[PDB]
A and B are shown apart, each in its own frame.
Chain A
Amino acid sequence: SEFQKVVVIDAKGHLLGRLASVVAKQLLGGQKVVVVRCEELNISGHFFRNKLKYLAYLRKACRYNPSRGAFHFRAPSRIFQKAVRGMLPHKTARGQAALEHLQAVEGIPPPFDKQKRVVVPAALRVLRLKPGRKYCTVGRLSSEVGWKYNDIVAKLEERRKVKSAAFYQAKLAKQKKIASAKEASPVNQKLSQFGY
């Protein structure tokens, strides 16, 4: 609704195609998008079903010089980028330029873990899929078809959450202090008639 220079999307609990469709529209709209925490993206359908959907992707390779053939990227960030790229006119210069405005990373690197991460309610699993419906995480689905960095990313995520929690405790301690001083001022209720 309002644009920023860059948007950092925390991609935990978002559906693959539901999020990739919104991102495809925002990129052509002319906005830089960073998708973080890709290895917790969700896809509808039970895990074995989607494992077959991706093992069929491994079957597509040119019979002459397979180095020419299709390249089946395994990282969760690369699978999400494949979804967006297929939802863009990448065979042009405006479609090509839309990819260059898209960043997809697994986990939250230090350049971005100190900024606010927004979510896309048009793609959130809790608001789209009926309860009891089977679904599979991209991070698990990559660690079973070749992606070999699942554990290290989980290891670094645990450390990052610890640091992020410590920051939040400090920020809450400061925030509760100013809130005490916020209510302490008398002018608060001589502006209360304005709703603030």
Chain B
Amino acid sequence: HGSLGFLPRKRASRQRGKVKAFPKDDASKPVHLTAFLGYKAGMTHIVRDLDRPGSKMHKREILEAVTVIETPPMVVVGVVGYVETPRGLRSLTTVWAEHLSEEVKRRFYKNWFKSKKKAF
């Protein structure tokens, strides 16, 4: 058959996976980040002691396949504020930093070499 929840079966219009939903904001909790961005390096397997009560291999060794993804520390380079509106969230303003490295300036051009490097 095939699930109908995953159509139109068409190529993703993006390469970096879009976070279509963020955790609910609660003011009782203080501040933290909610996401990150890594690179799938590959997978290996491990051996682990299994502390699950009632499981048939409680306190016994299993073998698990694990995915290793490398995540060099991300750099915060701006802040954006969305305002609640009857027509949905709307990006009100955006503020950046001073020193935007060449790594992120490349994101703004299809040809970084031929450009005059005039971003920001």
Residues of A within 8 A of B (CB): 106-107, 149, 152-153, 155-156
Contacts and interface: CB of A to CB of B under 8 A. Distances in A.
B7 to A, nearest CB: 11
A interface: dominant SS: helix
B83 to A, nearest CB: 10
11 contacts: A106-B86, A107-B86, A149-B86, A149-B87, A149-B88, A152-B84, A152-B85, A152-B86, A153-B86, A155-B84, A156-B86
Contacts, number: 11
Specify the main secondary structure of chain B where it touches its partner.
loop
Nearest to B8: A67
Contacts of A149: 86-88
A155 B83 CA distance: 13
Nearest to B85: A152
B53 to A, nearest CB: 41
Interface string B71-114: 00000000000001111100000000000000000000000000
Nearest to A105: B86
A107 B86 CA distance: 9
A156 B85 CA distance: 9
